[PDB]
Amino acid sequence: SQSVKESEGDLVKPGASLTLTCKASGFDFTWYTMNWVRQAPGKGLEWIASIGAGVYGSNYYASWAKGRFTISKASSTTVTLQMTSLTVADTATYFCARDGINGGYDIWGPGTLVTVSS
Amino acid sequence: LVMTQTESPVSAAGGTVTIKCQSSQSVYNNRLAWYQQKPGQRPKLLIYSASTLASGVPSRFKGSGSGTQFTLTISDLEWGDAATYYCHGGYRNDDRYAFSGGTELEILSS
Ligand SMILES: O=P(O)(O)OC[C@H]1O[C@H](O)[C@@H](O)[C@@H](O)[C@@H]1O
Known about the structure:
By secondary structure, chain A is mostly beta strands. Chain A is built from no helices and eleven strands. In chain A, strands 2, 4, 5, 6, 9, 10 and 11 form a seven-stranded mixed sheet that branches. A four-stranded antiparallel sheet of chain A has the order 1-3-8-7, with no helix packed on it.
């Protein structure tokens, strides 16, 4: 009925940069805040960053993520996660999730794998 | 700012479980929500706003109260409820949102 799909995951060396992309279907980010949440193997969900509703929506970051991540609304239907200084601990499945109502991540993508290794 | 959950619980098939959730800061608004994640699957929203049910979710699932201290109690347990359960809260102007560690639910014969 409504959905989002992450893309552009990869195998990559330590110290490299990478950009992920989430594309909406059936709705706009005019009324909803969008989030990037990841899941490292063997570990729980971790909130990375959010960006607010509409063009002038505001951005927030987890403390740990501020230097090396950047969230962006390319357009009303496309979100972006720029990942700059990757380390092995950044290996995870990365999720795009819509804040439907008052903090409930109503809808999720399948996720993309990012692996950092030698 | 951190949240915590219980560790590795197990429970019997009409059974009831209560999953406890703590947050070090008091949440903003009533922004606490609950998810289940079955392996190989994306998270699914269960409860939002501390106690309100999401779409398609049964009323075996209930959430409570406010804080700081929250609980999710599943009653009338079925096999398809073996999964991992997560807690997730909103706050205030960076560190806006946070997830807990996740409590895996082992369903057992009666
Ligand atoms: O920016 P705010 O006012 O803190 O609220 C963020 C809000 O974003 C969107 O409007 C929705 O996803 C709401 O569910 C969410 O609560």
